[PDB]
Each structure stands twice: as C-alpha cells, then as structure tokens.
From a paper:
We report, for the first time, the crystal structure of MDHAR of O. sativa L. japonica (OsMDHAR) to understand its detailed mechanism. Structural comparison of OsMDHAR to other proteins, using the DALI server, indicated that it has the same fold as that of putidaredoxin reductase (Pdr), biphenyl dioxygenase (BphA4)18 and rubredoxin reductase (RdxR). All these proteins consist of three domains: an NAD(P)-binding domain, an FAD-binding domain, and a C-terminal domain, as shown in Figs 1 and 2.
For structural confirmation of binding of the enzyme to an AsA analogue, we co-crystallized OsMDHAR bound to NADH and isoascorbic acid (ISD), as D-erythroascorbic acid is not commercially available. We observed an interpretable electron density map, suitable for ISD fitting. Superimposed structures of OsMDHAR-AsA and OsMDHAR-ISD complexes showed distinct binding conformations for both substrate ligands. In detail, ISD did not fit perfectly into the binding site of AsA. The binding site of ISD had more exposed surface area. In addition, we observed clear electron density for the di-hydroxyfuranone part of ISD, but not its di-hydroxyethyl part. This suggests that ISD may bind more loosely to the enzyme than AsA. The Arg320 residue forms hydrogen bonds with both AsA and ISD in the complex structures.
Author numbering: 4 to 418, 422 to 435
C-alpha cells in the first residue's frame, strides 16, 4: 500500500500542469504522486488532432509533453524522478473510497492520500455505446489518447489513398476531416446538425468553414447519422449506412460525437451538477481535501454568475494551477483569489485558425472578409447582449488583433454601428 500526501488521479493536461505548479510551490521528494492509466507522462492532448497527424515532421512523444503547449518548460519523465514526484503509469484506478482516502488499482494495489486532485478528464463517446449495428468493425476509430492516435496513424498508412468518413461536426470532426484530407484521403463528413460546430458557430461563420472545406474537396453530408456499417469477411469496415438510406464507402471511419466527464469513480461520494463534480472557486469538491480540475469540474464562473463546466485545454491548465495554489494556500493559511475565468476557445485546420473569447449570447454581427477563396481570410464576429459586447470571434487574427478581441470580451464595452469597422473597434478599446 502506497502513501502520499498529494495524489493527482489522471495523467493528462491538468495533471502535468498541477505537477508544474506543485514544483513552483516547493513540493518535496516523496510527497506527490500522479496515477495514470496511460503509459506516458502527461502531454499536451491538443497535439493529437493536429501535429500528430502531419504526414511529415509530425509531433511525437516526448516532444509534446507538457508544458510545451503554452510555451512552458518540457516535463520529461526524468523531471518527475529528479523532483521525487512519483509517476505511477499504466495503472487504472477502479475504486476510490473518499471516506478512507484510499484508491485501488485494477490489479488490487492500493494508494492513500491526504489531498486528492481528481483530473480524470473525459471519456470519448463511442457508437458501440449506442449499440449501433456493426460499430465493432475494425478501422472505426476514436481519438482521445496517444494510444488512439497511434492506431489512427497506422490506419492512415495502411489505407493510403483510400476513403475516409468522419462522423460528427464538432471539434473532432472539423480537425480530423482536415487531417485526413492532408493525408491524401477522399474525405466525407457526416453530421446531424444544420451547420458544423452548432454550439459556437453562427450560420454565417459556419457557412464560411463549410465552403472552405468544400473547396478543399471535403464532401459534407448534413442532416443525418450513421445507423450501421458493413464489414468484410475480416470484419474491417467497408461502408457507412446512413439514416437517410444512403451508403458511403469507407476504408477508415473516424468518429467524434462528444465526450463526457469521467466521474463514475465518485458517484454518490461528491455533489455533482451539470454532469460534472461540483466545486467552489478553489476547485475544492463537497469533500474536504478533494479537488476536481479540468474537464470534470463544474465550477462558479465569476464573470457570468453561473456554474459551468468547460472541456477545453486553457481551463485545464489554469484550473490545475489554481487548485495547487489553493491547497498550498490552506497549508500556510490562505488567502487565494477566486478563479476568474475568461473563456478562451480555438481551433486550427488547413491554413485556418480562429479564437473566441467570452460568451456567445445575444445578437451577432459579422465583420471583415469572409471569402473562402482566401488568402489568408480574416473575419470575425461580436455577440451583443444588453448593449454590451459579450463575446468575440476572429479568424485569421495577428497576435495584437487576438489580444484586442480578448480585451473586448473581458471588458464588455457598450455599443450601434460596429459592423462599420468591426476589427478597428477592438483595436481601439
Ligand atoms: C484529441 C483532442 C484534441 C483536443 N484539442 C483541443 C484544442 O485544440 N484546444 C482546446 O481548447 N481543447 C482541446 N481538447 C480538449 C482538451 O485536451 C481537454 O480539455 C484537456 O485534455 C482536459 O485535461 P484534463 O487533464 O481534464 O483531462 P485529460 O487530459 O483527458 O486527462 C485525463 C487523464 O486521467 C487518466 N484517467 C482517467 N481515469 C483514470 C483512472 N481511473 N485511472 C488512472 N487514470 C485515469 C486519463 O487516461 C488521462 O491521462 C482536445 C481534446 C482531444 C481529445
Ligand atoms: N480545438 C478544440 O477545442 C478541440 C479539438 C478537438 C477535440 N476537442 C474536445 O474533445 C472532446 C471531443 O470532441 P468532439 O468533437 O467529439 O465533441 P463535441 O462536443 O465538440 O461535438 C460532437 C459533435 O457530434 C455531433 N453528434 C452527436 N451525436 C451524433 C451522432 N450520433 N452522429 C453524428 N454526430 C453526432 C454533433 O454535431 C456535435 O457537434 C470535446 O471535449 C472537445 O471539446 C476540442
Ligand atoms: O494547446 C496546444 O497544445 C498543442 C501544442 O502545439 C503542443 O506543443 C497544440 O497543438 C495546441 O493547440
């Protein structure tokens, strides 16, 4: 049975960033462990949908260990041992007893803590979860962890020049459709909503990305879902059957239909809200000494006076740091500031890249141009509620422009004629 003062459960983004902050905060050898089911030390998960998939000069471990994704120092396994931070890899925790402060691995082993950080991230939703016919076929692929990414790269090699079907029109769909096309596949994206990224993109924004993709030769089939798959005698996928009776031939299927917080270890033991583990502004759960960070946390979003859960990397990094600051604060007597999060989302594909800051509520307007025949296109939007700008999006911004939209979102300036020189508005705030 192992004993640690601090245990981080999960070896992902939030775990690595927590490890960095513990080290900044003076953690001593033998005090901290990170327990992860993965076989590798924490890494910047966003690379798996982007650089990992380049057909040459691809990202690979140990390159994109944390914290290189935010311009930080890289934490190789050897950083952890030299600091006496125990990485316990290839270890899945299958039970957590918060009353006894003990965790039990799949293999029977046991681990105790005085302070626990839950950083278990999200599951990948799978068509097999739905019981979809033929969803067990080979080369139907998901992307959450580096092991999944390796399987996809291997399929991309095995099936080169063939046909790929991307199921889903969220972040994964967007990024992976682009990656497959760059890898020389005939690519078709299939999704049920009226335009891609329906939660964040407006119809205007979505139409830009759809036309851009179309121009790159990506086929887009809207208004339907996969209801079945054909497989060959070896059980490899050969076609995707759609709700509307169409069939798409496929050598590879990539599915991105959402993720859900991995919180079932704690079912009944902590308070839960909006699908995640409820926390305060310090990431502390119902149970004292038990924190929850990253994708699992439902936490108070100061600037919008609501609880929220966020499933993006910037929050994973920041929430991790905050927890460690709160823990360390309590040891010498806090105060620590409440988490004050400004939402930051972003995606890049092909030669495109956008950022969004704030909250996408209220009425929207589009500025700039907007032309999918490029180059490089530069256009944005503002979300306006109660006479204030609450949210801002920009595709193709320089660093000063991106900064300027972030400042709009953080300061919520009043407005009416923005559309006029939209970007200039941000540049003058
Ligand atoms: C492929 C991909 C690309 C993405 N790209 C972007 C992007 O470009 N921008 C952006 O904003 N967001 C992106 N995201 C979202 C972002 O990566 C997440 O918000 C972030 O990883 C959350 O970090 P976290 O540590 O909560 O969880 P995760 O990094 O998932 O870490 C969870 C860790 O806990 C381990 N775990 C879970 N249960 C157990 C257990 N029982 N025992 C031991 N270990 C366990 C997992 O294996 C993992 O190591 C991306 C996500 C994916 C999947
Ligand atoms: N740049 C980024 O921020 C980025 C990039 C990659 C992954 N991710 C994260 O990774 C996780 C997984 O992403 P995702 O794209 O899978 O989730 P997502 O929630 O961003 O979107 C999933 C999409 O799946 C579709 N959907 C739901 N059921 C479906 C079905 N039966 N058939 C077809 N489509 C269906 C909807 O169009 C929805 O838009 C999320 O937490 C996401 O935030 C983030
Ligand atoms: O935040 C990120 O982490 C990775 C970095 O580029 C990894 O260095 C990535 O691709 C991002 O968008």
């Amino acid at each position: 049975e192992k004993h640690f003062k601090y245990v981080i459960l999960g070896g992902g983004v939030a775990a690595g960033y927590a490890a960095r902050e513990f080290a900044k905060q003076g953690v001593k050898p033998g005090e901290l462990a990170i327990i992860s089911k993965e076989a590798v030390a924490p890494y910047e998960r966003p690379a798996l949908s982007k650089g990992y998939l380049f057909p040459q000069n691809a990202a690979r471990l140990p390159g994109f260990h944390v914290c290189v994704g935010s311009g930080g120092e890289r934490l190789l396994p050897e950083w952890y041992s030299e600091k006496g931070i125990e990485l316990i890899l290839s270890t899945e925790i299958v039970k957590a007893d918060l009353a006894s402060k003990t965790l039990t691995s799949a293999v029977g082993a046991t681990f105790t803590y005085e302070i626990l950080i839950i950083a278990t991230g999200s599951s990948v939703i799978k068509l097999s979860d739905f019981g979809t016919q033929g969803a067990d076929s080979n080369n139907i692929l998901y992307l959450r962890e580096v092991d999944d990414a390796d399987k996809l790269v291997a399929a991309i090699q095995a099936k080169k020049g063939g046909k790929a079907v991307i199921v889903g029109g969220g972040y994964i769909g967007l990024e992976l459709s682009a990656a497959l096309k760059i890898n020389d596949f005939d690519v078709t994206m299939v999704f049920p909503e009226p335009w891609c990224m329906p939660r964040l993109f407006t119809a205007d924004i979505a139409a830009f990305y759809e036309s851009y993709y179309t121009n790159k030769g990506v086929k887009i089939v809207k208004g339907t879902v996969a209801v079945g798959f054909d497989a060959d005698a070896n059980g490899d996928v050969t076609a995707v059957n759609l709700k509307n009776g169409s069939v798409l031939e496929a050598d590879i299927v990539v599915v991105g239909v959402g993720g859900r917080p991995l919180t079932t270890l704690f079912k009944g033991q902590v308070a839960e809200e909006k699908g995640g583990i409820k926390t305060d502004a310090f990431f502390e759960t119902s149970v004292p000494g038990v924190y929850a960070v990253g994708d699992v946390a439902t936490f108070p979003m100061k600037m919008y006076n609501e609880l929220r859960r966020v499933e993006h990397v910037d929050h994973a990094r920041k929430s991790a740091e905050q927890a460690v600051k709160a823990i360390k604060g309590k040891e010498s007597g806090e105060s620590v500031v409440e988490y004050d999060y400004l939402p930051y989302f972003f995606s890049r594909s092909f030669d495109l890249g956008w950022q969004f800051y704030g909250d996408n509520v209220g009425d929207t307007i589009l500025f700039g141009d907007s032309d999918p025949t490029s180059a490089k296109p530069k256009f944005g939007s503002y979300w306006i509620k109660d006479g204030k700008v609450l949210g801002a999006f920009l595709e193709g911004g320089s660093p000063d422009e991106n900064k300027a939209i972030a400042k709009v979102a953080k300061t919520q300036p009043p407005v009416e004629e923005l559309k006029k020189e939209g970007l200039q508005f941000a540049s003058k705030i």
